[PDB]
Amino acid sequence: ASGRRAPRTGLLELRCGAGSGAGGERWQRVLLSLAEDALTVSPADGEPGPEPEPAQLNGAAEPGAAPPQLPEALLLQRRRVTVRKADAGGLGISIKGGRENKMPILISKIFKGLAADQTEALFVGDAILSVNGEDLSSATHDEAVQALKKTGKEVVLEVKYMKEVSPYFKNSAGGTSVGWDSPPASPLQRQPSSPGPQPRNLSEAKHVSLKMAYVSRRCTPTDPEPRYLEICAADGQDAVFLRAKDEASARSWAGAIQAQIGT
């Protein structure tokens, strides 16, 4: 099953037992799949599958010098360039750095059109740090040369596009909405309704419609920013609340559900 589009799936912290007693909480990891107008929850795995040692067996694409169709999502961060001598060719760039004080190593030039040239992945404006699978951030310029110079066959250089890493003046991160926590009227008697069909059980999957769903943000477990999200299905069908790994992960979660539902 694969039709271009794909629902955003991620792990979140969901509570258990604490529904209307408050006598023994329990937060566990749970996977959440948000497509568009529907969210399908499900448990996550634990044992590791794909090892970080293997690196394909040279194939996929015949031409070029790297398996095309490289998705971003969680890989769009920094850059993982490579230099294959037994495929692309030799390297000929002019770097410059000086960590002796506080000058990070970066691309100063790309002499001729060597492997460094054909490798668009790299360009005169990136700072190296993790090469051939080894962070040498604590290896001044000289060490940078020997790091990529000693390598061979496949030099996986991991650089970071440094530009506006240090913003100017305070004008981001931080805000006080205040006012979205005082409803005019909220029935607290005709909510439970008569006992009958109510999809509020946790078995294996928790599918909920994003038609009249609501997203909330409450803090408690030492959450002075991230906080846990709350998904109330029209406050009359279901209510799944969970917290992400980082504050941003929740910003994207609540931001994705809110931007999707738009109730």
Side-chain angles (χ1 to χ4, degrees), residues 148-166:
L148 62 88
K149 170 231 202 227
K150 68 202 249 254
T151 331
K153 201 90 192 166
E154 71 211 55
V155 196
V156 188
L157 250 89
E158 211 163 288
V159 297
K160 215 205 131 207
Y161 238 92
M162 275 158 211
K163 288 219 222 88
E164 274 202 308
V165 188
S166 335

mmCIF file with all atom_site columns, all heavy atoms in Angstrom, residues 148-166:
data_model
loop_
_atom_site.group_PDB
_atom_site.id
_atom_site.type_symbol
_atom_site.label_atom_id
_atom_site.label_alt_id
_atom_site.label_comp_id
_atom_site.label_asym_id
_atom_site.label_entity_id
_atom_site.label_seq_id
_atom_site.pdbx_PDB_ins_code
_atom_site.Cartn_x
_atom_site.Cartn_y
_atom_site.Cartn_z
_atom_site.occupancy
_atom_site.B_iso_or_equiv
_atom_site.pdbx_formal_charge
_atom_site.auth_seq_id
_atom_site.auth_comp_id
_atom_site.auth_asym_id
_atom_site.auth_atom_id
_atom_site.pdbx_PDB_model_num
ATOM 1   N N   . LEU A 1 148 ? 39.620 13.752 6.202  1.00 0.00 ? 148 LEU A N   1
ATOM 2   C CA  . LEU A 1 148 ? 39.077 13.457 4.879  1.00 0.00 ? 148 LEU A CA  1
ATOM 3   C C   . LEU A 1 148 ? 40.168 13.011 3.906  1.00 0.00 ? 148 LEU A C   1
ATOM 4   O O   . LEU A 1 148 ? 39.876 12.431 2.861  1.00 0.00 ? 148 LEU A O   1
ATOM 5   C CB  . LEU A 1 148 ? 38.356 14.684 4.320  1.00 0.00 ? 148 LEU A CB  1
ATOM 6   C CG  . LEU A 1 148 ? 39.239 15.917 4.117  1.00 0.00 ? 148 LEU A CG  1
ATOM 7   C CD1 . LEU A 1 148 ? 39.884 15.889 2.740  1.00 0.00 ? 148 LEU A CD1 1
ATOM 8   C CD2 . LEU A 1 148 ? 38.427 17.189 4.305  1.00 0.00 ? 148 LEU A CD2 1
ATOM 9   N N   . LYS A 1 149 ? 41.424 13.289 4.249  1.00 0.00 ? 149 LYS A N   1
ATOM 10  C CA  . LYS A 1 149 ? 42.547 12.918 3.396  1.00 0.00 ? 149 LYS A CA  1
ATOM 11  C C   . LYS A 1 149 ? 42.927 11.454 3.598  1.00 0.00 ? 149 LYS A C   1
ATOM 12  O O   . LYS A 1 149 ? 43.230 10.743 2.640  1.00 0.00 ? 149 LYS A O   1
ATOM 13  C CB  . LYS A 1 149 ? 43.741 13.831 3.691  1.00 0.00 ? 149 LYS A CB  1
ATOM 14  C CG  . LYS A 1 149 ? 45.041 13.398 3.033  1.00 0.00 ? 149 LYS A CG  1
ATOM 15  C CD  . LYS A 1 149 ? 46.171 13.330 4.046  1.00 0.00 ? 149 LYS A CD  1
ATOM 16  C CE  . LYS A 1 149 ? 47.533 13.423 3.377  1.00 0.00 ? 149 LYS A CE  1
ATOM 17  N NZ  . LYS A 1 149 ? 48.470 12.381 3.879  1.00 0.00 ? 149 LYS A NZ  1
ATOM 18  N N   . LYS A 1 150 ? 42.909 11.008 4.848  1.00 0.00 ? 150 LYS A N   1
ATOM 19  C CA  . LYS A 1 150 ? 43.253 9.628  5.175  1.00 0.00 ? 150 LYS A CA  1
ATOM 20  C C   . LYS A 1 150 ? 42.185 8.663  4.669  1.00 0.00 ? 150 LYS A C   1
ATOM 21  O O   . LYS A 1 150 ? 42.474 7.505  4.365  1.00 0.00 ? 150 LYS A O   1
ATOM 22  C CB  . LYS A 1 150 ? 43.430 9.468  6.686  1.00 0.00 ? 150 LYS A CB  1
ATOM 23  C CG  . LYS A 1 150 ? 42.138 9.622  7.473  1.00 0.00 ? 150 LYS A CG  1
ATOM 24  C CD  . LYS A 1 150 ? 42.408 9.997  8.924  1.00 0.00 ? 150 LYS A CD  1
ATOM 25  C CE  . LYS A 1 150 ? 42.062 8.857  9.869  1.00 0.00 ? 150 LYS A CE  1
ATOM 26  N NZ  . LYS A 1 150 ? 40.802 9.120  10.617 1.00 0.00 ? 150 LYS A NZ  1
ATOM 27  N N   . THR A 1 151 ? 40.949 9.144  4.588  1.00 0.00 ? 151 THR A N   1
ATOM 28  C CA  . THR A 1 151 ? 39.835 8.323  4.125  1.00 0.00 ? 151 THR A CA  1
ATOM 29  C C   . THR A 1 151 ? 40.082 7.810  2.710  1.00 0.00 ? 151 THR A C   1
ATOM 30  O O   . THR A 1 151 ? 41.086 8.148  2.081  1.00 0.00 ? 151 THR A O   1
ATOM 31  C CB  . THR A 1 151 ? 38.536 9.128  4.171  1.00 0.00 ? 151 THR A CB  1
ATOM 32  O OG1 . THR A 1 151 ? 38.591 10.112 5.186  1.00 0.00 ? 151 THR A OG1 1
ATOM 33  C CG2 . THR A 1 151 ? 37.311 8.276  4.423  1.00 0.00 ? 151 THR A CG2 1
ATOM 34  N N   . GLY A 1 152 ? 39.157 6.993  2.216  1.00 0.00 ? 152 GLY A N   1
ATOM 35  C CA  . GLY A 1 152 ? 39.288 6.441  0.880  1.00 0.00 ? 152 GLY A CA  1
ATOM 36  C C   . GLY A 1 152 ? 38.159 5.488  0.539  1.00 0.00 ? 152 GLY A C   1
ATOM 37  O O   . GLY A 1 152 ? 37.568 4.876  1.429  1.00 0.00 ? 152 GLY A O   1
ATOM 38  N N   . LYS A 1 153 ? 37.857 5.363  -0.754 1.00 0.00 ? 153 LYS A N   1
ATOM 39  C CA  . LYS A 1 153 ? 36.787 4.479  -1.225 1.00 0.00 ? 153 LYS A CA  1
ATOM 40  C C   . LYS A 1 153 ? 35.417 5.133  -1.066 1.00 0.00 ? 153 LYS A C   1
ATOM 41  O O   . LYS A 1 153 ? 34.612 5.141  -1.997 1.00 0.00 ? 153 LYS A O   1
ATOM 42  C CB  . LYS A 1 153 ? 36.817 3.139  -0.483 1.00 0.00 ? 153 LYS A CB  1
ATOM 43  C CG  . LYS A 1 153 ? 36.099 2.020  -1.221 1.00 0.00 ? 153 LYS A CG  1
ATOM 44  C CD  . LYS A 1 153 ? 37.041 1.271  -2.150 1.00 0.00 ? 153 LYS A CD  1
ATOM 45  C CE  . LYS A 1 153 ? 36.279 0.366  -3.104 1.00 0.00 ? 153 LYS A CE  1
ATOM 46  N NZ  . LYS A 1 153 ? 37.139 -0.115 -4.220 1.00 0.00 ? 153 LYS A NZ  1
ATOM 47  N N   . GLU A 1 154 ? 35.163 5.682  0.114  1.00 0.00 ? 154 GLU A N   1
ATOM 48  C CA  . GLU A 1 154 ? 33.905 6.340  0.401  1.00 0.00 ? 154 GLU A CA  1
ATOM 49  C C   . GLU A 1 154 ? 34.047 7.245  1.615  1.00 0.00 ? 154 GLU A C   1
ATOM 50  O O   . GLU A 1 154 ? 34.068 6.794  2.760  1.00 0.00 ? 154 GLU A O   1
ATOM 51  C CB  . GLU A 1 154 ? 32.803 5.320  0.628  1.00 0.00 ? 154 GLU A CB  1
ATOM 52  C CG  . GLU A 1 154 ? 32.939 4.559  1.933  1.00 0.00 ? 154 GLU A CG  1
ATOM 53  C CD  . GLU A 1 154 ? 32.397 3.145  1.846  1.00 0.00 ? 154 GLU A CD  1
ATOM 54  O OE1 . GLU A 1 154 ? 32.837 2.394  0.951  1.00 0.00 ? 154 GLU A OE1 1
ATOM 55  O OE2 . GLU A 1 154 ? 31.533 2.789  2.674  1.00 0.00 ? 154 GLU A OE2 1
ATOM 56  N N   . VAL A 1 155 ? 34.156 8.523  1.339  1.00 0.00 ? 155 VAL A N   1
ATOM 57  C CA  . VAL A 1 155 ? 34.310 9.534  2.378  1.00 0.00 ? 155 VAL A CA  1
ATOM 58  C C   . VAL A 1 155 ? 32.991 10.239 2.667  1.00 0.00 ? 155 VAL A C   1
ATOM 59  O O   . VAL A 1 155 ? 32.680 11.263 2.062  1.00 0.00 ? 155 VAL A O   1
ATOM 60  C CB  . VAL A 1 155 ? 35.354 10.593 1.982  1.00 0.00 ? 155 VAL A CB  1
ATOM 61  C CG1 . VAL A 1 155 ? 35.795 11.389 3.201  1.00 0.00 ? 155 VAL A CG1 1
ATOM 62  C CG2 . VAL A 1 155 ? 36.551 9.946  1.299  1.00 0.00 ? 155 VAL A CG2 1
ATOM 63  N N   . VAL A 1 156 ? 32.221 9.690  3.601  1.00 0.00 ? 156 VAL A N   1
ATOM 64  C CA  . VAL A 1 156 ? 30.941 10.277 3.969  1.00 0.00 ? 156 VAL A CA  1
ATOM 65  C C   . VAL A 1 156 ? 31.139 11.498 4.862  1.00 0.00 ? 156 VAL A C   1
ATOM 66  O O   . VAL A 1 156 ? 31.250 11.376 6.081  1.00 0.00 ? 156 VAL A O   1
ATOM 67  C CB  . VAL A 1 156 ? 30.044 9.260  4.701  1.00 0.00 ? 156 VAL A CB  1
ATOM 68  C CG1 . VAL A 1 156 ? 28.650 9.830  4.910  1.00 0.00 ? 156 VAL A CG1 1
ATOM 69  C CG2 . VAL A 1 156 ? 29.982 7.952  3.929  1.00 0.00 ? 156 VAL A CG2 1
ATOM 70  N N   . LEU A 1 157 ? 31.186 12.676 4.246  1.00 0.00 ? 157 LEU A N   1
ATOM 71  C CA  . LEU A 1 157 ? 31.375 13.918 4.986  1.00 0.00 ? 157 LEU A CA  1
ATOM 72  C C   . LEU A 1 157 ? 30.036 14.507 5.419  1.00 0.00 ? 157 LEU A C   1
ATOM 73  O O   . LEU A 1 157 ? 29.144 14.720 4.599  1.00 0.00 ? 157 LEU A O   1
ATOM 74  C CB  . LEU A 1 157 ? 32.144 14.931 4.131  1.00 0.00 ? 157 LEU A CB  1
ATOM 75  C CG  . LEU A 1 157 ? 33.568 15.225 4.601  1.00 0.00 ? 157 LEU A CG  1
ATOM 76  C CD1 . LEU A 1 157 ? 34.551 14.249 3.970  1.00 0.00 ? 157 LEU A CD1 1
ATOM 77  C CD2 . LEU A 1 157 ? 33.954 16.659 4.269  1.00 0.00 ? 157 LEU A CD2 1
ATOM 78  N N   . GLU A 1 158 ? 29.906 14.773 6.714  1.00 0.00 ? 158 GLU A N   1
ATOM 79  C CA  . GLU A 1 158 ? 28.682 15.343 7.261  1.00 0.00 ? 158 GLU A CA  1
ATOM 80  C C   . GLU A 1 158 ? 28.917 16.783 7.697  1.00 0.00 ? 158 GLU A C   1
ATOM 81  O O   . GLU A 1 158 ? 29.557 17.036 8.720  1.00 0.00 ? 158 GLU A O   1
ATOM 82  C CB  . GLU A 1 158 ? 28.186 14.513 8.446  1.00 0.00 ? 158 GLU A CB  1
ATOM 83  C CG  . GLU A 1 158 ? 26.674 14.525 8.606  1.00 0.00 ? 158 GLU A CG  1
ATOM 84  C CD  . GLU A 1 158 ? 26.173 13.408 9.502  1.00 0.00 ? 158 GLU A CD  1
ATOM 85  O OE1 . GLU A 1 158 ? 26.196 12.240 9.062  1.00 0.00 ? 158 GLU A OE1 1
ATOM 86  O OE2 . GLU A 1 158 ? 25.759 13.704 10.643 1.00 0.00 ? 158 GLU A OE2 1
ATOM 87  N N   . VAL A 1 159 ? 28.403 17.722 6.912  1.00 0.00 ? 159 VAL A N   1
ATOM 88  C CA  . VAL A 1 159 ? 28.564 19.141 7.209  1.00 0.00 ? 159 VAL A CA  1
ATOM 89  C C   . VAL A 1 159 ? 27.239 19.784 7.602  1.00 0.00 ? 159 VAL A C   1
ATOM 90  O O   . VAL A 1 159 ? 26.175 19.183 7.458  1.00 0.00 ? 159 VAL A O   1
ATOM 91  C CB  . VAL A 1 159 ? 29.152 19.901 6.005  1.00 0.00 ? 159 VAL A CB  1
ATOM 92  C CG1 . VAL A 1 159 ? 30.544 19.386 5.673  1.00 0.00 ? 159 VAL A CG1 1
ATOM 93  C CG2 . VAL A 1 159 ? 28.230 19.789 4.797  1.00 0.00 ? 159 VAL A CG2 1
ATOM 94  N N   . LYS A 1 160 ? 27.316 21.016 8.095  1.00 0.00 ? 160 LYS A N   1
ATOM 95  C CA  . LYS A 1 160 ? 26.131 21.754 8.507  1.00 0.00 ? 160 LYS A CA  1
ATOM 96  C C   . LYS A 1 160 ? 26.090 23.125 7.839  1.00 0.00 ? 160 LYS A C   1
ATOM 97  O O   . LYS A 1 160 ? 27.044 23.897 7.925  1.00 0.00 ? 160 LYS A O   1
ATOM 98  C CB  . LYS A 1 160 ? 26.111 21.915 10.028 1.00 0.00 ? 160 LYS A CB  1
ATOM 99  C CG  . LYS A 1 160 ? 24.714 21.863 10.624 1.00 0.00 ? 160 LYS A CG  1
ATOM 100 C CD  . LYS A 1 160 ? 24.647 22.601 11.955 1.00 0.00 ? 160 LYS A CD  1
ATOM 101 C CE  . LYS A 1 160 ? 23.468 23.559 12.003 1.00 0.00 ? 160 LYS A CE  1
ATOM 102 N NZ  . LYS A 1 160 ? 23.714 24.695 12.933 1.00 0.00 ? 160 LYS A NZ  1
ATOM 103 N N   . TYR A 1 161 ? 24.979 23.420 7.171  1.00 0.00 ? 161 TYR A N   1
ATOM 104 C CA  . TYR A 1 161 ? 24.816 24.698 6.487  1.00 0.00 ? 161 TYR A CA  1
ATOM 105 C C   . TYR A 1 161 ? 24.703 25.841 7.492  1.00 0.00 ? 161 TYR A C   1
ATOM 106 O O   . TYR A 1 161 ? 23.606 26.198 7.921  1.00 0.00 ? 161 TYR A O   1
ATOM 107 C CB  . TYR A 1 161 ? 23.578 24.665 5.587  1.00 0.00 ? 161 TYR A CB  1
ATOM 108 C CG  . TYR A 1 161 ? 23.881 24.948 4.133  1.00 0.00 ? 161 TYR A CG  1
ATOM 109 C CD1 . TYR A 1 161 ? 24.156 23.915 3.246  1.00 0.00 ? 161 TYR A CD1 1
ATOM 110 C CD2 . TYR A 1 161 ? 23.891 26.250 3.646  1.00 0.00 ? 161 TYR A CD2 1
ATOM 111 C CE1 . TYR A 1 161 ? 24.433 24.170 1.916  1.00 0.00 ? 161 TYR A CE1 1
ATOM 112 C CE2 . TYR A 1 161 ? 24.166 26.513 2.318  1.00 0.00 ? 161 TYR A CE2 1
ATOM 113 C CZ  . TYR A 1 161 ? 24.436 25.471 1.458  1.00 0.00 ? 161 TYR A CZ  1
ATOM 114 O OH  . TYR A 1 161 ? 24.711 25.728 0.134  1.00 0.00 ? 161 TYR A OH  1
ATOM 115 N N   . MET A 1 162 ? 25.844 26.410 7.865  1.00 0.00 ? 162 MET A N   1
ATOM 116 C CA  . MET A 1 162 ? 25.873 27.512 8.821  1.00 0.00 ? 162 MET A CA  1
ATOM 117 C C   . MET A 1 162 ? 25.639 28.847 8.123  1.00 0.00 ? 162 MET A C   1
ATOM 118 O O   . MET A 1 162 ? 26.320 29.180 7.152  1.00 0.00 ? 162 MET A O   1
ATOM 119 C CB  . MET A 1 162 ? 27.210 27.538 9.562  1.00 0.00 ? 162 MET A CB  1
ATOM 120 C CG  . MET A 1 162 ? 27.251 26.625 10.777 1.00 0.00 ? 162 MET A CG  1
ATOM 121 S SD  . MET A 1 162 ? 28.930 26.177 11.255 1.00 0.00 ? 162 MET A SD  1
ATOM 122 C CE  . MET A 1 162 ? 28.660 24.551 11.953 1.00 0.00 ? 162 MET A CE  1
ATOM 123 N N   . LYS A 1 163 ? 24.674 29.610 8.626  1.00 0.00 ? 163 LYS A N   1
ATOM 124 C CA  . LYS A 1 163 ? 24.351 30.913 8.055  1.00 0.00 ? 163 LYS A CA  1
ATOM 125 C C   . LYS A 1 163 ? 23.781 31.847 9.118  1.00 0.00 ? 163 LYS A C   1
ATOM 126 O O   . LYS A 1 163 ? 24.484 32.709 9.644  1.00 0.00 ? 163 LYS A O   1
ATOM 127 C CB  . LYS A 1 163 ? 23.352 30.756 6.903  1.00 0.00 ? 163 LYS A CB  1
ATOM 128 C CG  . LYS A 1 163 ? 23.963 30.150 5.649  1.00 0.00 ? 163 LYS A CG  1
ATOM 129 C CD  . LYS A 1 163 ? 23.426 30.815 4.390  1.00 0.00 ? 163 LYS A CD  1
ATOM 130 C CE  . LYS A 1 163 ? 23.131 29.795 3.304  1.00 0.00 ? 163 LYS A CE  1
ATOM 131 N NZ  . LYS A 1 163 ? 21.754 29.241 3.419  1.00 0.00 ? 163 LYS A NZ  1
ATOM 132 N N   . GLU A 1 164 ? 22.504 31.664 9.428  1.00 0.00 ? 164 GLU A N   1
ATOM 133 C CA  . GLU A 1 164 ? 21.832 32.482 10.427 1.00 0.00 ? 164 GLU A CA  1
ATOM 134 C C   . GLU A 1 164 ? 21.552 31.675 11.691 1.00 0.00 ? 164 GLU A C   1
ATOM 135 O O   . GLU A 1 164 ? 20.452 31.724 12.242 1.00 0.00 ? 164 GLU A O   1
ATOM 136 C CB  . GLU A 1 164 ? 20.526 33.045 9.863  1.00 0.00 ? 164 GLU A CB  1
ATOM 137 C CG  . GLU A 1 164 ? 20.706 34.339 9.087  1.00 0.00 ? 164 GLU A CG  1
ATOM 138 C CD  . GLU A 1 164 ? 19.425 35.145 8.992  1.00 0.00 ? 164 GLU A CD  1
ATOM 139 O OE1 . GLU A 1 164 ? 18.395 34.577 8.572  1.00 0.00 ? 164 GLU A OE1 1
ATOM 140 O OE2 . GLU A 1 164 ? 19.452 36.344 9.339  1.00 0.00 ? 164 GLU A OE2 1
ATOM 141 N N   . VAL A 1 165 ? 22.553 30.928 12.142 1.00 0.00 ? 165 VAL A N   1
ATOM 142 C CA  . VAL A 1 165 ? 22.418 30.106 13.339 1.00 0.00 ? 165 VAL A CA  1
ATOM 143 C C   . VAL A 1 165 ? 22.237 30.965 14.586 1.00 0.00 ? 165 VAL A C   1
ATOM 144 O O   . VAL A 1 165 ? 21.611 30.542 15.557 1.00 0.00 ? 165 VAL A O   1
ATOM 145 C CB  . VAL A 1 165 ? 23.644 29.194 13.534 1.00 0.00 ? 165 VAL A CB  1
ATOM 146 C CG1 . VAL A 1 165 ? 23.399 28.202 14.661 1.00 0.00 ? 165 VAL A CG1 1
ATOM 147 C CG2 . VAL A 1 165 ? 23.982 28.469 12.240 1.00 0.00 ? 165 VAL A CG2 1
ATOM 148 N N   . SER A 1 166 ? 22.790 32.175 14.554 1.00 0.00 ? 166 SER A N   1
ATOM 149 C CA  . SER A 1 166 ? 22.691 33.090 15.681 1.00 0.00 ? 166 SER A CA  1
ATOM 150 C C   . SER A 1 166 ? 21.844 34.312 15.325 1.00 0.00 ? 166 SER A C   1
ATOM 151 O O   . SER A 1 166 ? 22.363 35.310 14.825 1.00 0.00 ? 166 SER A O   1
ATOM 152 C CB  . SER A 1 166 ? 24.084 33.535 16.127 1.00 0.00 ? 166 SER A CB  1
ATOM 153 O OG  . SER A 1 166 ? 25.066 32.580 15.765 1.00 0.00 ? 166 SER A OG  1
#
